[PDB]
Coordinates of C-alpha atoms and ligand atoms in Angstrom, one line a residue:
Chain A
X8 CA 20.4 -65.2 29.0
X9 CA 20.8 -68.5 31.0
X10 CA 24.4 -69.7 30.7
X11 CA 24.0 -73.3 30.2
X12 CA 27.4 -73.7 32.0
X13 CA 28.7 -75.0 35.1
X14 CA 28.2 -71.8 37.5
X15 CA 31.9 -73.0 39.0
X16 CA 33.6 -72.5 35.8
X17 CA 32.8 -68.8 36.8
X18 CA 32.5 -68.7 40.6
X19 CA 33.7 -70.4 43.7
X20 CA 31.3 -71.7 46.0
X21 CA 31.9 -70.7 49.7
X22 CA 29.1 -71.5 52.2
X23 CA 25.4 -72.0 52.5
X24 CA 23.1 -69.0 52.9
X25 CA 19.9 -68.8 54.8
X26 CA 20.3 -72.1 56.7
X27 CA 17.6 -73.5 54.0
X28 CA 14.8 -71.1 54.5
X29 CA 15.3 -70.1 50.9
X30 CA 16.1 -73.5 49.5
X31 CA 20.0 -74.2 48.7
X32 CA 21.6 -70.5 48.4
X33 CA 25.3 -70.3 47.9
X34 CA 27.8 -67.4 49.2
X35 CA 30.1 -67.7 45.7
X36 CA 33.3 -65.5 44.9
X37 CA 33.6 -64.5 41.4
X38 CA 37.1 -65.9 40.3
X39 CA 37.3 -62.8 37.7
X40 CA 36.5 -59.8 39.3
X41 CA 36.9 -61.2 43.1
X42 CA 33.2 -60.0 43.7
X43 CA 30.9 -61.8 46.2
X44 CA 27.8 -62.7 44.5
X45 CA 24.7 -65.3 45.8
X46 CA 23.9 -68.1 43.8
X47 CA 20.2 -69.6 44.4
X48 CA 20.1 -72.9 42.8
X49 CA 16.7 -75.0 42.8
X50 CA 16.4 -78.7 41.6
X51 CA 14.6 -79.9 38.6
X52 CA 12.2 -83.0 38.7
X53 CA 12.9 -82.6 35.4
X54 CA 9.1 -82.4 34.8
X55 CA 9.8 -78.3 34.6
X56 CA 10.3 -76.2 31.4
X57 CA 13.5 -73.8 31.6
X58 CA 11.4 -71.9 29.5
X59 CA 8.3 -71.1 31.6
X60 CA 11.0 -69.2 33.8
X61 CA 11.9 -67.0 30.4
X62 CA 8.9 -64.2 31.3
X63 CA 9.8 -64.0 35.1
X64 CA 13.8 -63.9 34.5
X65 CA 12.9 -60.9 32.3
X66 CA 11.4 -59.1 35.3
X67 CA 14.3 -60.0 37.6
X68 CA 16.7 -58.6 35.1
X69 CA 14.8 -55.3 34.1
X70 CA 15.0 -54.0 37.4
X71 CA 17.3 -51.2 37.6
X72 CA 16.8 -50.3 41.4
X73 CA 19.1 -50.0 44.3
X74 CA 16.4 -51.3 46.7
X75 CA 16.1 -54.7 45.0
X76 CA 18.3 -57.3 44.8
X77 CA 20.5 -56.9 41.5
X78 CA 20.6 -59.5 39.2
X79 CA 23.6 -60.9 37.4
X80 CA 22.6 -63.9 35.3
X81 CA 20.9 -67.5 35.8
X82 CA 22.9 -70.8 35.0
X83 CA 21.5 -74.3 34.4
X84 CA 23.5 -77.0 34.3
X85 CA 22.5 -80.7 35.2
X86 CA 19.1 -80.5 36.3
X87 CA 20.2 -77.3 38.9
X88 CA 19.0 -74.0 38.3
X89 CA 21.3 -71.1 39.6
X90 CA 20.2 -67.6 40.3
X91 CA 23.3 -65.1 40.5
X92 CA 22.3 -62.2 42.7
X93 CA 23.8 -59.4 44.5
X94 CA 25.0 -60.9 47.9
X95 CA 23.8 -59.1 51.1
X96 CA 26.1 -59.9 53.9
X97 CA 23.7 -59.2 56.8
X98 CA 21.5 -61.9 55.6
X99 CA 17.5 -60.9 56.1
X100 CA 16.1 -59.0 58.7
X101 CA 14.4 -62.1 60.3
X102 CA 17.9 -63.4 60.9
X103 CA 18.9 -60.4 62.5
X104 CA 16.0 -59.7 64.8
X105 CA 15.9 -63.3 66.1
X106 CA 19.4 -62.0 67.4
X107 CA 19.3 -58.7 68.3
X108 CA 15.5 -58.7 69.4
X109 CA 12.9 -55.8 67.8
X110 CA 13.9 -53.1 65.9
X111 CA 13.5 -49.4 66.8
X112 CA 10.6 -47.6 64.9
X113 CA 13.4 -45.3 63.5
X114 CA 15.2 -48.4 62.1
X115 CA 11.8 -49.9 61.1
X116 CA 11.0 -46.4 59.2
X117 CA 13.9 -46.4 57.3
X118 CA 13.4 -50.1 56.4
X119 CA 9.6 -49.3 55.3
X120 CA 11.0 -46.3 53.3
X121 CA 13.5 -48.5 51.8
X122 CA 11.0 -51.1 50.8
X123 CA 8.5 -48.4 49.6
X124 CA 10.8 -47.2 47.1
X125 CA 11.6 -50.7 46.1
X126 CA 7.9 -51.6 45.9
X127 CA 7.2 -48.1 44.2
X128 CA 9.3 -48.8 41.3
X129 CA 8.5 -52.6 41.2
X130 CA 4.8 -51.2 40.6
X131 CA 5.8 -48.7 38.4
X132 CA 6.8 -51.6 36.5
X133 CA 3.5 -53.4 36.9
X134 CA 5.0 -56.4 39.0
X135 CA 3.9 -57.4 42.6
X136 CA 6.4 -59.3 44.8
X137 CA 3.7 -61.2 46.4
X138 CA 5.6 -62.0 49.6
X139 CA 6.9 -59.2 51.5
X140 CA 8.2 -60.2 54.9
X141 CA 11.1 -59.6 57.3
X142 CA 12.4 -62.9 55.7
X143 CA 12.6 -61.6 52.0
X144 CA 14.2 -57.9 53.2
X145 CA 18.0 -58.4 52.8
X146 CA 20.5 -56.3 54.7
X147 CA 24.0 -55.8 52.9
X148 CA 27.3 -55.2 55.4
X149 CA 26.6 -51.4 54.7
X150 CA 23.2 -51.5 56.3
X151 CA 21.1 -51.1 53.1
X152 CA 17.8 -52.5 52.6
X153 CA 17.2 -54.8 49.2
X154 CA 13.9 -56.7 48.6
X155 CA 15.0 -60.3 47.9
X156 CA 13.6 -62.3 44.7
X157 CA 10.2 -62.1 43.6
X158 CA 8.0 -64.2 40.9
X159 CA 11.1 -66.5 40.3
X160 CA 10.1 -68.6 44.0
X161 CA 6.6 -68.9 43.3
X162 CA 6.2 -71.0 39.9
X163 CA 8.7 -73.6 40.0
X168 CA 6.8 -75.1 44.7
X169 CA 5.7 -76.0 41.3
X170 CA 2.4 -77.4 42.7
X171 CA -0.9 -75.7 42.8
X174 CA -7.3 -75.5 43.9
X175 CA -7.7 -78.4 41.3
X176 CA -5.3 -80.0 38.0
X177 CA -4.2 -77.2 35.7
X178 CA -5.6 -79.5 32.4
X179 CA -8.8 -79.6 33.8
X180 CA -9.0 -76.2 35.6
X181 CA -11.2 -73.4 34.0
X182 CA -9.9 -70.1 32.5
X183 CA -11.4 -68.6 35.6
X184 CA -9.7 -71.1 37.7
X185 CA -6.4 -71.0 35.4
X186 CA -6.3 -67.1 35.9
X187 CA -6.5 -67.2 39.4
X188 CA -4.3 -69.7 39.8
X189 CA -1.7 -67.5 38.0
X190 CA -2.4 -63.9 39.1
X191 CA -4.1 -65.0 42.4
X192 CA -6.6 -62.2 42.8
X193 CA -3.6 -59.9 43.3
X194 CA -3.2 -56.2 42.9
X195 CA 0.1 -54.1 43.4
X196 CA -1.7 -52.5 46.4
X197 CA -1.2 -56.1 48.5
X198 CA 2.2 -55.6 49.0
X199 CA 1.5 -52.4 50.8
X200 CA -0.8 -54.8 53.4
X201 CA 2.3 -57.0 53.7
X202 CA 4.4 -54.1 54.2
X203 CA 1.9 -53.3 57.6
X204 CA 2.7 -56.5 58.5
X205 CA 6.2 -57.0 58.3
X206 CA 6.5 -53.4 60.3
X207 CA 4.6 -55.2 63.2
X208 CA 6.9 -58.4 62.4
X209 CA 9.7 -55.8 62.6
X210 CA 8.4 -54.3 65.9
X211 CA 7.5 -57.4 67.6
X212 CA 9.2 -60.2 66.4
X213 CA 6.4 -62.0 64.7
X214 CA 3.8 -61.0 62.5
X215 CA 0.2 -60.7 64.0
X216 CA -1.5 -64.1 64.6
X217 CA 1.8 -66.0 64.3
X218 CA 0.7 -68.7 67.1
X219 CA -2.4 -69.4 65.1
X220 CA -2.6 -71.9 62.5
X221 CA -2.6 -70.5 59.1
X222 CA -5.5 -71.6 57.6
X223 CA -7.4 -70.5 60.6
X224 CA -6.2 -66.9 59.9
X225 CA -7.1 -66.8 56.2
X226 CA -10.9 -67.6 57.4
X227 CA -10.6 -64.9 60.0
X228 CA -9.7 -62.6 57.1
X229 CA -12.6 -63.3 54.8
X230 CA -15.2 -62.4 57.7
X231 CA -17.5 -59.1 56.8
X232 CA -16.3 -57.9 60.7
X233 CA -12.9 -58.5 60.5
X234 CA -10.4 -56.3 61.9
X235 CA -7.2 -55.3 60.4
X236 CA -4.2 -55.9 63.2
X237 CA -3.1 -53.5 65.2
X238 CA 0.5 -52.8 67.2
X239 CA -0.1 -54.6 70.6
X240 CA 1.8 -51.8 72.9
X241 CA 0.2 -48.5 72.0
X242 CA 2.6 -46.5 74.0
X243 CA 5.6 -47.8 72.5
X244 CA 5.0 -46.4 69.0
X245 CA 4.8 -43.1 67.5
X246 CA 1.6 -41.5 66.0
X247 CA 3.0 -41.8 62.7
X248 CA 3.7 -45.3 63.1
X249 CA 0.7 -46.3 64.4
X250 CA -1.3 -44.6 61.4
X251 CA 1.2 -46.1 59.0
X252 CA 0.1 -49.7 60.4
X253 CA -3.6 -48.4 60.0
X254 CA -3.5 -46.9 56.3
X255 CA -1.2 -49.9 55.2
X256 CA -3.5 -52.5 56.6
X257 CA -6.7 -50.9 55.0
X258 CA -9.1 -53.7 54.6
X259 CA -10.7 -52.6 51.1
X260 CA -7.8 -52.6 48.4
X261 CA -9.7 -49.5 46.6
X262 CA -8.9 -47.2 49.7
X263 CA -5.6 -48.3 50.3
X264 CA -2.8 -46.1 49.6
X265 CA -0.5 -46.9 46.5
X266 CA 3.6 -47.3 47.0
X267 CA 4.3 -44.0 46.1
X268 CA 1.4 -42.3 48.5
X269 CA 3.0 -44.2 51.3
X270 CA 6.2 -42.6 50.5
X271 CA 4.7 -39.3 51.4
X272 CA 3.5 -40.5 54.7
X273 CA 4.8 -38.7 57.9
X274 CA 6.8 -42.3 59.2
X275 CA 8.7 -42.8 55.9
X276 CA 9.3 -39.1 54.7
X277 CA 10.6 -37.6 57.8
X278 CA 14.3 -36.5 57.9
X279 CA 17.3 -38.7 59.5
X280 CA 16.5 -41.9 57.7
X281 CA 19.8 -43.5 56.7
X282 CA 21.6 -46.8 56.9
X283 CA 23.2 -45.7 60.0
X284 CA 20.3 -47.1 61.7
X285 CA 20.9 -50.7 60.3
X286 CA 24.7 -50.2 61.1
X287 CA 23.1 -49.9 64.8
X288 CA 21.3 -53.1 64.3
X289 CA 24.5 -54.8 62.6
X290 CA 26.6 -53.9 65.8
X291 CA 23.9 -55.0 68.3
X292 CA 24.2 -58.2 66.1
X293 CA 28.0 -59.1 66.5
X294 CA 28.8 -57.8 69.9
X295 CA 25.6 -56.8 71.8
Chain B
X8 CA -18.0 -87.2 64.8
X9 CA -13.9 -87.6 64.3
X10 CA -13.8 -91.1 66.6
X11 CA -10.3 -90.3 68.1
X12 CA -10.2 -94.0 67.9
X13 CA -7.6 -96.8 66.3
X14 CA -9.8 -97.6 63.1
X15 CA -8.1 -101.2 63.2
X16 CA -10.7 -101.3 66.3
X17 CA -13.7 -101.3 64.0
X18 CA -12.3 -102.5 60.6
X19 CA -9.5 -105.0 59.5
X20 CA -7.3 -103.3 56.3
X21 CA -6.8 -105.5 53.4
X22 CA -5.1 -103.9 50.7
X23 CA -4.1 -100.5 49.3
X24 CA -6.0 -98.7 46.8
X25 CA -5.5 -96.3 44.0
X26 CA -1.8 -97.1 43.9
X27 CA -0.6 -93.6 45.6
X28 CA -2.4 -91.4 43.3
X29 CA -4.7 -90.5 46.5
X30 CA -2.2 -91.1 49.3
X31 CA -2.5 -93.9 51.3
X32 CA -5.9 -95.1 50.7
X33 CA -6.8 -98.8 52.2
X34 CA -9.5 -101.4 51.5
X35 CA -10.9 -102.4 54.7
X36 CA -13.6 -105.2 56.0
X37 CA -15.9 -103.9 58.9
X38 CA -15.5 -106.2 61.9
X39 CA -19.0 -106.1 62.7
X40 CA -21.3 -105.5 59.6
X41 CA -18.8 -107.3 57.2
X42 CA -19.2 -104.6 54.9
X43 CA -16.0 -103.3 52.8
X44 CA -15.0 -99.2 53.0
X45 CA -12.3 -97.2 52.0
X46 CA -10.1 -95.6 54.6
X47 CA -7.8 -92.5 53.2
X48 CA -5.2 -92.1 56.0
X49 CA -3.4 -88.7 55.7
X50 CA -0.1 -88.2 57.9
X51 CA -0.1 -84.9 60.3
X52 CA 3.1 -82.5 60.5
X53 CA 2.0 -82.1 63.4
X54 CA 1.8 -78.5 62.5
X55 CA -2.0 -79.3 61.1
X56 CA -5.1 -78.6 63.5
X57 CA -7.9 -81.1 63.5
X58 CA -10.4 -78.7 64.0
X59 CA -9.5 -76.7 60.7
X60 CA -11.3 -79.7 58.7
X61 CA -14.2 -79.8 60.9
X62 CA -15.9 -77.1 58.4
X63 CA -14.8 -79.3 55.5
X64 CA -15.2 -82.6 57.6
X65 CA -19.1 -81.5 58.2
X66 CA -19.4 -80.8 54.1
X67 CA -18.4 -84.4 53.2
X68 CA -20.9 -85.4 55.8
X69 CA -24.0 -83.6 54.8
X70 CA -24.1 -85.3 51.4
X71 CA -27.0 -87.3 51.1
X72 CA -26.9 -87.9 47.2
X73 CA -26.1 -91.5 45.6
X74 CA -23.5 -89.9 42.9
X75 CA -21.3 -88.6 45.6
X76 CA -18.9 -91.2 47.6
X77 CA -20.7 -92.1 50.6
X78 CA -19.2 -90.8 54.0
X79 CA -19.2 -92.9 57.0
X80 CA -17.0 -91.2 59.8
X81 CA -13.4 -90.2 60.3
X82 CA -10.7 -91.2 62.5
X83 CA -7.6 -89.5 64.1
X84 CA -5.2 -91.4 66.1
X85 CA -1.1 -91.2 66.2
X86 CA -0.7 -88.5 63.5
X87 CA -3.0 -90.6 61.3
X88 CA -6.5 -88.9 60.1
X89 CA -8.4 -92.0 58.6
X90 CA -11.4 -90.8 56.2
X91 CA -14.0 -93.6 55.7
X92 CA -15.8 -93.5 52.5
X93 CA -17.9 -95.9 50.4
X94 CA -15.9 -98.3 48.4
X95 CA -15.7 -98.6 44.8
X96 CA -14.2 -102.0 43.6
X97 CA -13.5 -100.7 40.1
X98 CA -11.2 -97.9 41.3
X99 CA -11.7 -94.3 39.1
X100 CA -12.4 -94.1 35.6
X101 CA -8.7 -93.1 34.9
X102 CA -7.5 -96.6 36.1
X103 CA -10.4 -98.2 34.0
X104 CA -9.5 -96.6 30.6
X105 CA -5.7 -97.1 31.2
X106 CA -6.7 -100.5 30.6
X107 CA -10.0 -100.5 28.5
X108 CA -9.4 -97.5 26.1
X109 CA -11.0 -94.7 25.4
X110 CA -15.0 -94.8 26.8
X111 CA -17.9 -94.4 23.9
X112 CA -19.9 -91.7 23.8
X113 CA -22.9 -93.7 25.2
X114 CA -20.6 -94.2 28.5
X115 CA -19.4 -90.9 28.7
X116 CA -23.2 -89.6 28.7
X117 CA -23.9 -91.7 31.4
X118 CA -20.7 -90.7 33.4
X119 CA -21.7 -86.9 32.7
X120 CA -25.2 -87.6 33.5
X121 CA -24.4 -89.1 36.9
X122 CA -21.7 -86.5 37.4
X123 CA -24.1 -83.5 37.0
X124 CA -26.9 -85.1 38.8
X125 CA -24.2 -85.0 41.9
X126 CA -22.6 -81.8 40.8
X127 CA -26.1 -80.3 40.6
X128 CA -26.6 -81.9 44.1
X129 CA -23.2 -80.4 45.4
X130 CA -24.0 -76.7 43.8
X131 CA -27.6 -76.7 45.3
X132 CA -25.6 -77.2 48.7
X133 CA -23.3 -74.1 47.5
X134 CA -20.6 -76.5 47.3
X135 CA -17.6 -76.8 44.7
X136 CA -15.8 -79.8 43.9
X137 CA -13.2 -78.0 42.6
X138 CA -11.2 -81.1 41.0
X139 CA -13.7 -82.8 38.6
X140 CA -11.7 -85.4 36.4
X141 CA -11.2 -88.9 35.3
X142 CA -9.3 -90.1 38.4
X143 CA -12.0 -88.5 40.7
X144 CA -15.0 -90.6 39.4
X145 CA -15.1 -93.6 40.6
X146 CA -16.5 -97.0 39.7
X147 CA -18.3 -99.7 41.9
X148 CA -18.7 -103.2 40.6
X149 CA -22.4 -102.1 39.9
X150 CA -20.8 -99.6 37.1
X151 CA -22.3 -96.9 39.3
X152 CA -21.0 -93.8 39.1
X153 CA -19.3 -92.0 42.4
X154 CA -17.5 -88.6 42.9
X155 CA -14.7 -88.7 44.9
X156 CA -14.2 -86.6 47.7
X157 CA -13.7 -82.9 47.4
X158 CA -12.6 -80.1 49.8
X159 CA -10.9 -82.5 52.3
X160 CA -8.1 -83.2 49.5
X161 CA -7.5 -79.5 49.5
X162 CA -6.6 -77.9 52.9
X163 CA -4.1 -80.3 54.6
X168 CA -0.5 -80.6 50.3
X169 CA -1.1 -77.9 53.1
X170 CA 1.2 -75.2 51.2
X171 CA -0.4 -72.1 49.6
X174 CA 1.4 -67.1 46.7
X175 CA 2.9 -65.6 49.6
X176 CA 2.7 -66.4 53.5
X177 CA -0.5 -66.6 55.2
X178 CA 0.2 -64.5 57.9
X179 CA 1.8 -61.3 55.9
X180 CA -0.9 -62.1 53.1
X181 CA -3.6 -59.5 52.5
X182 CA -7.4 -59.9 53.1
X183 CA -7.8 -60.1 49.0
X184 CA -5.0 -62.7 48.9
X185 CA -6.3 -64.4 52.1
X186 CA -9.7 -64.5 50.5
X187 CA -8.4 -65.7 47.0
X188 CA -5.9 -67.8 48.6
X189 CA -9.3 -70.1 49.9
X190 CA -12.0 -69.6 47.8
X191 CA -9.3 -69.3 44.6
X192 CA -11.7 -67.0 42.2
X193 CA -13.8 -70.2 42.2
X194 CA -17.6 -70.4 41.4
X195 CA -20.0 -73.5 41.1
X196 CA -20.0 -73.2 37.3
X197 CA -16.1 -74.2 36.9
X198 CA -17.1 -77.8 37.9
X199 CA -19.0 -77.6 34.3
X200 CA -15.8 -76.5 32.5
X201 CA -14.0 -79.0 34.4
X202 CA -16.8 -82.0 33.5
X203 CA -16.1 -80.9 29.9
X204 CA -12.6 -81.6 30.1
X205 CA -13.1 -84.6 31.5
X206 CA -15.4 -85.6 28.8
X207 CA -12.6 -84.9 26.2
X208 CA -10.4 -87.1 28.6
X209 CA -12.3 -90.0 28.8
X210 CA -13.0 -89.6 24.8
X211 CA -9.2 -89.5 24.2
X212 CA -7.6 -91.1 27.2
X213 CA -6.0 -87.0 28.0
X214 CA -7.1 -84.1 28.7
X215 CA -6.3 -81.3 26.2
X216 CA -2.6 -80.0 26.3
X217 CA -1.7 -83.2 28.4
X218 CA 1.6 -82.9 26.6
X219 CA 2.1 -79.6 27.6
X220 CA 4.0 -78.0 30.7
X221 CA 1.1 -77.3 33.3
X222 CA 2.3 -73.4 33.6
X223 CA 2.1 -73.4 30.3
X224 CA -1.4 -74.1 29.4
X225 CA -2.4 -71.7 32.3
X226 CA -0.8 -68.8 30.3
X227 CA -2.5 -69.8 27.0
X228 CA -5.9 -69.5 29.0
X229 CA -5.4 -66.1 30.4
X230 CA -5.0 -64.4 26.7
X231 CA -7.9 -62.8 25.4
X232 CA -7.9 -64.8 22.2
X233 CA -7.6 -68.4 23.8
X234 CA -10.1 -70.8 22.4
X235 CA -11.6 -73.6 24.6
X236 CA -10.5 -77.1 23.7
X237 CA -12.3 -79.3 21.4
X238 CA -12.6 -83.1 20.7
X239 CA -9.9 -83.8 17.6
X240 CA -12.2 -86.4 16.0
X241 CA -15.2 -84.2 14.6
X242 CA -16.7 -87.5 12.7
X243 CA -16.0 -89.9 15.8
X244 CA -18.8 -88.0 18.0
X245 CA -22.3 -86.7 17.9
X246 CA -23.3 -83.0 17.5
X247 CA -25.3 -83.6 20.9
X248 CA -21.5 -84.4 22.3
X249 CA -20.0 -81.7 20.5
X250 CA -22.1 -79.1 21.6
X251 CA -21.9 -80.5 25.2
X252 CA -18.2 -79.7 25.2
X253 CA -18.8 -76.6 23.6
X254 CA -21.2 -75.3 26.3
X255 CA -19.4 -77.1 28.9
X256 CA -16.3 -75.2 27.9
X257 CA -17.8 -71.9 27.6
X258 CA -15.1 -69.2 28.3
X259 CA -17.0 -66.9 30.1
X260 CA -18.6 -68.0 33.5
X261 CA -21.6 -65.6 32.9
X262 CA -22.4 -67.7 29.7
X263 CA -21.8 -71.1 30.9
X264 CA -24.7 -73.3 32.1
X265 CA -25.4 -74.3 35.4
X266 CA -25.4 -78.2 36.4
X267 CA -29.4 -78.6 36.2
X268 CA -29.3 -76.9 32.7
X269 CA -26.5 -79.4 31.6
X270 CA -29.0 -81.9 32.8
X271 CA -31.5 -80.4 30.4
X272 CA -29.2 -80.9 27.7
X273 CA -29.4 -83.7 24.8
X274 CA -26.7 -85.6 25.5
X275 CA -27.3 -86.7 29.2
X276 CA -31.4 -86.5 29.1
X277 CA -31.4 -89.0 26.0
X278 CA -33.0 -92.2 27.1
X279 CA -31.0 -95.5 27.5
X280 CA -28.1 -94.1 29.8
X281 CA -27.7 -97.0 32.6
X282 CA -25.1 -98.9 34.5
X283 CA -24.9 -101.3 32.2
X284 CA -23.0 -99.1 30.0
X285 CA -20.5 -99.1 32.5
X286 CA -21.0 -103.0 33.2
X287 CA -19.6 -103.2 29.6
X288 CA -16.4 -101.2 30.5
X289 CA -15.9 -103.4 33.8
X290 CA -16.1 -106.4 31.6
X291 CA -13.7 -105.3 28.9
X292 CA -11.8 -104.5 31.9
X293 CA -11.2 -108.1 33.4
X294 CA -11.4 -110.2 30.0
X295 CA -11.1 -108.1 27.0
Ligands
2YE1 C1 25.9 -65.9 56.2 N1 24.7 -65.3 55.8 C2 24.9 -63.6 55.3 C3 23.5 -65.8 55.7 O1 23.7 -67.1 55.8 C4 22.2 -65.3 54.9 C5 22.1 -65.1 53.7 C6 20.9 -64.4 53.1 C7 21.2 -63.9 51.8 C8 22.1 -63.1 51.2 N2 22.4 -62.3 50.1 C9 21.1 -62.9 48.9 N3 21.1 -62.4 47.9 C10 20.0 -63.1 46.9 C11 19.3 -63.9 48.3 C12 20.1 -63.7 49.6 C13 20.2 -64.1 50.8 C14 20.0 -64.3 53.7 C15 20.2 -65.2 55.1 C16 21.2 -65.2 55.6 N4 21.3 -65.6 56.9
2YE2 C1 -8.0 -102.2 43.8 N1 -9.0 -100.9 43.5 C2 -10.2 -101.3 43.4 C3 -7.8 -99.8 43.5 O1 -7.0 -99.9 43.7 C4 -8.4 -98.3 43.3 C5 -9.5 -98.0 44.6 C6 -10.0 -96.6 44.1 C7 -10.9 -95.9 45.5 C8 -12.2 -96.9 45.6 N2 -13.0 -96.2 46.6 C9 -12.9 -95.4 47.1 N3 -13.7 -94.8 47.8 C10 -13.0 -93.3 48.2 C11 -11.6 -93.3 47.6 C12 -11.8 -94.6 46.7 C13 -10.8 -94.9 46.0 C14 -9.3 -95.8 43.2 C15 -8.4 -96.2 42.2 C16 -8.1 -97.6 42.4 N4 -7.1 -98.1 41.5

């Protein structure tokens, strides 16, 4: 259901969102219900095909989990594709910690638990987020955690490796799946936990292609937390097991929900309400 | 050896090359020797790192084969990276057949033989071209075939899948190797032969992401030549064996140099001299 209609017939555009870090996203108010939503608008070339997204848009619609950002329908109108999603008034975690500074272990643990619940739901649906990081974890004014859109922000970028028509089936398959297994979101989550702990992912001051070269070496060591004494053993093990080099030995999302760090009691949105208070005042 | 010097100290820029299909490439005359060369200039962000290309520039330099376009040194100067290569006055095959129309089977066979000789050399060096197609096969005024630059035109685009710092080692390795084996250039060559035969690769009028979806299906059929009677059995088999779906059963570059199509006598640059004559006059 991609309503071929001007989205302004249903909603009123209020302001920009994200400051351009996710393209042109808008805070919009529903004329009817009065609710607030988010509208991500993506431009067309127009060499793009609206139907190649159908298999991806059905993915974002059939997601009945509270930790995934809700989807409310799409809109295509004058080479402009508007994705309507649940709004999260606190922005991303990256927006937050760039003001509040580093997060606490308890806050990280709650965010990790909520992200795992969304991942374990996503992987049970045999989907892969592909880009778990601070900027794709949204917070609402209730301090609740929402994974951002996935699979849609990938294809249509819209630029591959080679040239699609001359590619080989092995090259074609890898240009789509990307050598991905669901267990790479677990790695991404471990890097995100380090990101939420140290404001920056490991090797952030290193050129991107360089770090990828480093990760193919047979003696490559997965990253760690810089300050040992600052974090608990549970957090240090959570980083170790999420950052398992071999995907065969890497715990699944559900198995990680059994881990000490995220199954401990006392994890709730209040930890983020503290973080959103440290945002406005302190 | 990336001479940190204004390339105008050595050469004189004459005209643009390719019409923007390879970025800003220049026809340049050597002040000293008087020779003509090509200078591909790529802009810097400058978030790029010049040393990440070192492993790739050594690849383009240690290529002592006549079917690979020669390399003469690089130049970095004011956020501008100038790659100096052997000049090919007839442009690419895509530039040619977009004027001369389709190529003949003999012309395709000669171009395929020469490309295989370069590929078989490239693969013996354990390298992969990754993007074999009409636009990357250059012709000189002698009608000789030259494979264009490879591995350099890939990284620094300079945009990946996910975000490099949060990627997993499996994701990192695939974002670099691309699930590639040397035997995918053979597939690319078969598509190129169809391209040189029909002016367009198979499924050119189909959206790129769509054809990649089609190639992952278990019942996907590799493409063929449209006109059966127009081509010989050797050419039809050459398309079949180069377009082998499983890379395990796909012939290597050397094995393909044994094929009837490219080992037959009578293949020489005269076939392309005909094509370059059909270019200027007819
Ligand atoms: C004022 N403000 C909160 C923002 O500018 C803001 C909004 C988002 C945001 C909110 N909700 C969303 N729903 C789907 C995507 C999405 C993105 C992210 C970062 C931001 N800095
Ligand atoms: C006037 N003319 C021939 C061109 O405009 C032209 C030149 C090239 C070309 C020639 N030599 C090269 N060496 C390394 C890259 C490279 C590219 C390709 C296509 C073109 N239409």
